[PDB]
């Protein structure tokens, strides 16, 4: 409650708190904590949240969520030839 | 590794067997409310279906000897479903006969 | 026996003539001097409107007992009005028993025609098979 | 020493009276249970050998009066003893009036009551309840008496009176048999429903659920919803209500359990929401395994869905091998 | 008298089960 109670102000502050409470949830509603974590990361830095949210997504349906977050020409070419490809397109583009 | 699950399942299975015996004991006895009379059964015969229900009444009640205790739920359900198939106009003929017996 | 304002046993009962209720004179008098009203219904009442409890006049009464003719007549209403409900308990329960008897005798009359045909068919199958 | 002297007791009366004065002296040392208890058993024994001598019940009443003078549950064992010989004497009720005089004066005598009520049966009900004014085995036994007399509902009442006493520990020991029996009796919903409600404060959930399914069903499913074995059950009953819930159940299940979520997911997407289920199969396979690799390989092989996603899958599982090997 | 009809009603549908067996035994013998 104290971890979630830590206010989300701005983008990086809320994303920093997302790292805290997610680790707290992990170590100790598993789906709803992941969903509230998904909205915190998506509702943030927007450039750095592509590598932060997705890095704990494989650990955390999967194909659709990765394509929306990753969304470039070379990435589509790499896909046609599934989590590693979205990671390649997130860091580069 | 089951533990207190076989005891719970044995109580659940023993609970199921008691639910089958009480319901299939008797329709009239289980729902809501006689002296033993072998002479009344002897006098009533002096016709075969009447003697069958008389021995059925003497068995369930247990100058009165008991014996009959081997005559199960699945055979009665198919017997009830078959007789239901054989059975506005039927509602009025039952209301008229009920008024005749009331008179 | 009680005063409705205080809840005590009033030592000087006076009954009002707007909301019929026995008040203690000393209590109700102060209620009227506060404002000319009856405490229960809040209708207008003065001190002269209030009337002490009195012996009727010249006809002598006796206490309310089982002997007294009017108390005995209201008793016989209780007897019959209770016995009239006793009849409903047996009229309503008769309409369930005769309704279950009507459906029971119909299921008996619908079933015994099938006992008569199986006694025919099982003996006819024994009459047919044994001859062959 | 009094016992060896008793063995030595021709003036046995002298040794006995000397044992009495010895009681007068030893009593000072006692400032009591086994001392007073043996003191009473021996005094009454002296009146017992006196009884054999026809020398005794009155003096026995005197020594018992000294036991009254003693200054406690063991003393109640002494009262139980004077009562014991007193009943063995041939005056049963007369002694019971005395132990009753003591308890009315007010517990040790109750063990003698269990010694007495056990055969007093061969009406007895109040005789038994006198114990309740002052022992679960005793309780179940007594309820079994009324059951033998088939008072039925009265018997259930007894279980009501027991459980108000012993609290969530012993009460369970009563309550498991009480449930199995009362359900066996009437087999009206609201009363038994309430009875489980009172009851609830693990197996109880199972009895209760077993009841609900065959006498509202969803309500029961809510109750199971309200540990691995428990998860396994619910899933079974939900499957009994039809297939669709069971895939749903696992999602609840996730929060060795991964083997079970895999067990449900296997026929889930395997028979196939289905995309969310397959992606869930990936999320679970990645959740924590060579047989699972055979599973994903089977899912890939099933397509008449791509070597690339498959190699990526084996790559991810290899990454899991990396995170696993990295662990200390 | 309604309760006497309920015993005969349930006693009769036990007697039909034995009569159906005698018909079932007959249909097997006719086939042979």
Curated annotation (Swiss-Prot), chain A:
Location(s) in or outside the cell: Nucleus; Nucleus speckle
Residues with the Phosphoserine modification: 18
Tissue expression profile of the protein: Widely expressed. Highly expressed in testis. Not detected in brain and lung.
Residue spans of the HAT repeats: 20-47, 57-81
Family the UniProt entry places it in: Belongs to the crooked-neck family.
Assembly behavior: Identified in the spliceosome C complex. Present in a spliceosome complex assembled in vitro containing CRNKL1, HPRP8BP and SNRPB2. Component of the minor spliceosome, which splices U12-type introns. Isoform 2 seems to be predominant in the spliceosome complex. Interacts with PPIL2 (via the PPIase cyclophilin-type domain); they may form a trimeric complex with HSP90.
Function (record text): Involved in pre-mRNA splicing process. As a component of the minor spliceosome, involved in the splicing of U12-type introns in pre-mRNAs.
The protein's name in its UniProt record: Crooked neck-like protein 1
Organism: Homo sapiens (Human)
Organism lineage: Eukaryota, Metazoa, Chordata, Craniata, Vertebrata
Curated annotation (Swiss-Prot), chain B:
Gene: CDC5L
Function: DNA-binding protein involved in cell cycle control. May act as a transcription activator. Plays a role in pre-mRNA splicing as core component of precatalytic, catalytic and postcatalytic spliceosomal complexes. Component of the PRP19-CDC5L complex that forms an integral part of the spliceosome and is required for activating pre-mRNA splicing. The PRP19-CDC5L complex may also play a role in the response to DNA damage (DDR). As a component of the minor spliceosome, involved in the splicing of U12-type introns in pre-mRNAs.
Organism: Homo sapiens (Human)
Protein name: Cell division cycle 5-like protein
Disease: A chromosomal aberration involving CDC5L is found in multicystic renal dysplasia. Translocation t(6;19)(p21;q13.1) with USF2.
Subcellular location, record wording: Nucleus; Nucleus speckle; Cytoplasm
Annotated S-S bridges: none
UniProt modification remark: Phosphorylated on serine and threonine residues. Has no effect on subcellular location nor on homodimerization. Phosphorylated in vitro by CDK2. Phosphorylation enhances interaction with PPP1R8.
Portion of the full-length sequence here: 503 to 629 of 802
Region Interaction with DAPK3: start-end pairs: 1-103
Family classification: Belongs to the CEF1 family.
Protein origin, superkingdom: Eukaryota
Tissues in which the UniProt entry reports expression: Ubiquitously expressed in both fetal and adult tissues.
Curated annotation (Swiss-Prot), chain C:
Free-text tissue specificity from the UniProt record: Ubiquitous. Weakly expressed in senescent cells of different tissue origins. Highly expressed in tumor cell lines.
U-box domain ranges (all copies): 1-71
Expression triggers: By gamma irradiation and chemical mutagens but not by UV irradiation.
Location of N6-acetyllysine modifications: 120
Location within or outside the cell: Nucleus; Nucleus, Nucleoplasm; Cytoplasm, Cytoskeleton, Spindle; Cytoplasm
Functional description taken from the UniProt entry: Ubiquitin-protein ligase which is a core component of several complexes mainly involved pre-mRNA splicing and DNA repair. Required for pre-mRNA splicing as component of the spliceosome. Core component of the PRP19C/Prp19 complex/NTC/Nineteen complex which is part of the spliceosome and participates in its assembly, its remodeling and is required for its activity. During assembly of the spliceosome, mediates 'Lys-63'-linked polyubiquitination of the U4 spliceosomal protein PRPF3.
Note on domains (UniProt): The 7 WD repeats are necessary and sufficient to support interaction with the RPA complex.
Family membership noted in the UniProt record: Belongs to the WD repeat PRP19 family.
Protein's name according to its UniProt entry: Pre-mRNA-processing factor 19
Complete-protein stretch covered: 3 to 134 of 504
Swiss-Prot record, chain E:
Family of this protein: Belongs to the WD repeat PRP19 family.
Inducing stimuli: By gamma irradiation and chemical mutagens but not by UV irradiation.
N6-acetyllysine carried by residues: 21
Coiled coil: none
Name the record gives this protein: Pre-mRNA-processing factor 19
Top-rank lineage group of the source organism: Eukaryota
Function (record text): Ubiquitin-protein ligase which is a core component of several complexes mainly involved pre-mRNA splicing and DNA repair. Required for pre-mRNA splicing as component of the spliceosome. Core component of the PRP19C/Prp19 complex/NTC/Nineteen complex which is part of the spliceosome and participates in its assembly, its remodeling and is required for its activity. During assembly of the spliceosome, mediates 'Lys-63'-linked polyubiquitination of the U4 spliceosomal protein PRPF3.
Subcellular locations according to the entry: Nucleus; Nucleus, Nucleoplasm; Cytoplasm, Cytoskeleton, Spindle; Cytoplasm
Boundaries of the shown chain within the full protein: 102 to 133 of 504
UniProt note: domains: The 7 WD repeats are necessary and sufficient to support interaction with the RPA complex.
Tissue: Ubiquitous. Weakly expressed in senescent cells of different tissue origins. Highly expressed in tumor cell lines.
